[PDB]
Design a protein around this ligand. Sequence first.
Ligand SMILES: CC(C)CCC[C@@H](C)[C@H]1CC[C@H]2[C@@H]3CC=C4C[C@@H](O)CC[C@]4(C)[C@H]3CC[C@]12C
Ligand SMILES: CC(C)CCC[C@@H](C)[C@H]1CC[C@H]2[C@@H]3CC=C4C[C@@H](O)CC[C@]4(C)[C@H]3CC[C@]12C
Lengths: 115, 115, 168, 168
Amino acid sequence: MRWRDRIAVLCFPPGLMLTVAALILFFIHMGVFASDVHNFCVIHNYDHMSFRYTVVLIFSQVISIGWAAMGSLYAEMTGDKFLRCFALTILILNGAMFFNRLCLEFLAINYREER
Amino acid sequence: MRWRDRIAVLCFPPGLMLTVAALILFFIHMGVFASDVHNFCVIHNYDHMSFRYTVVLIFSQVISIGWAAMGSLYAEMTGDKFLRCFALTILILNGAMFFNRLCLEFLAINYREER
Amino acid sequence: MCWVMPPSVFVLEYYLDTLWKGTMLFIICLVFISCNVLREVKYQETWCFPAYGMVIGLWLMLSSIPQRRLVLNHTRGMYHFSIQGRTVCQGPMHLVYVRLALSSDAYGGRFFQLVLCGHKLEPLVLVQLSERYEQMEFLGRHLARKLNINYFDYLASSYRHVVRHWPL
Amino acid sequence: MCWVMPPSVFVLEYYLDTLWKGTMLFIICLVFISCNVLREVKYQETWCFPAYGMVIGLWLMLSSIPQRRLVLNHTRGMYHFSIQGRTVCQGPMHLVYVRLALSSDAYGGRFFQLVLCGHKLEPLVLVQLSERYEQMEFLGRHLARKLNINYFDYLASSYRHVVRHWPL
Ligand SMILES: CC(C)CCC[C@@H](C)[C@H]1CC[C@H]2[C@@H]3CC=C4C[C@@H](O)CC[C@]4(C)[C@H]3CC[C@]12C
Ligand SMILES: CC(C)CCC[C@@H](C)[C@H]1CC[C@H]2[C@@H]3CC=C4C[C@@H](O)CC[C@]4(C)[C@H]3CC[C@]12C
């Protein structure tokens, strides 16, 4: 249809947008991961490293993972290989980045606080 | 067509993308404008203001103005009112944005350096 | 309400209820803003949960809708999918139906809903009452008296359902 | 080279020269990276001009294009627009033309180019030789000997141009 009008309004076509949201979640979480690694390696400024927001961005991680999955499932029935490849690539990169941040946080454990 | 395939590859449809580039220039330039006013008003840490990059981001400003104008001209013949309204709104916001930053630089002229 | 809505003089109009969810999300966040829990002793801050709630609520609020309508005008109407502004779906019959759908849980309790089927149409979910079967095709005959098109039932054709327009 | 190209046995194939632009942009900005001008006395750094160079060259390189082809096969081919992978434009004749285009400066010097007109087709820009008209329609007759479709001239029909297929 008028993608034009599709992108017009009232709302929007099926899912899609919900898939590209995982992309911009990937963008911001990659930026935060880069800042974490940068502050861990050279500058050594543990005062302003993300030791403080710990569980809330992990919850953001998991809702983004579920969102990318649900978008892939809700976009697979279009019958076109490109959309499926798009969604599956986003799922794979989000899962890899989640596991990477989990390994990073489990590694830097002696640096936050003690209970 | 298959916007799908349009967004597929090899390149892309006419202009468009060149119009939405002005949008993300507006994003980054409004970001640095916000940082500049924030440093001017309360925190007062002029060492880290945008005193150092002053002409290159002005050149980026003028190239974004020209880009948004050329995209509006190159997308007006689609015959659809929504695209014209889109491009004209981006042109207007970029122009008012540019005049705002020109005024602010002309105001803070005693804080840079002197010849 | 039984003799007001099924007559449905000419066109029908329809909306979505997602604006209720957006308004409730806004109310919940505005409660969450002022004087929330003070868990600095938890070595964490939970403002990002209402921030994500605001992202979701703002996106859901953006789902605006002018009065989803068709050409269910009691004439030879085309049943063209109509929206104030843009129009998308057009078809000569054979697509607008009314179908009964069933849902089940692990226990086996059955819930009955109804959908006006078509290319990106709106459903006919009844007002929170599905435990018994009641009358089935009586409201179906009322829809037939409106602009008879279909009244589909569950599973295949078999029996116990009526059709009015066919494309062969 | 005068003989080899006109027969253009069956299909023709075509590409773009924007890859050259991306390549020279990358080379120039790579030169710009190492040991540029030292204008810290100018109270400024000019690295963001080549950063915009990165951006422009990387986008211009992204315009990949596999061998733009048609159904100019010397048969009853439909001249359907063909690309390795996707296909976009289809048309039963009446759209693929060859047209002479003219450009002028403030002085009045005339420059002549050629375009295979159609729905998002590719042009026939000759290799940097346009001061005189030479023979004009002899190459048009050779295109006609290929798969005769049109040979359009400037302005309206009038005279001095030949048509082969018409939709009336
Ligand atoms: C709300 C939804 C969309 C999730 C997005 C989370 C955003 C809002 C969060 C997650 C990552 C966060 C940043 C992570 C790191 C830094 C640097 C630190 O020294 C102070 C906090 C600060 C500056 C945070 C600000 C807020 C932030 C950007
Ligand atoms: C290259 C094209 C796309 C234009 C993009 C301009 C970008 C690269 C420029 C413009 C605004 C710039 C930033 C403006 C402000 C700051 C804070 C200052 O204390 C140091 C420089 C720094 C961190 C700059 C880095 C480079 C920057 C982000």
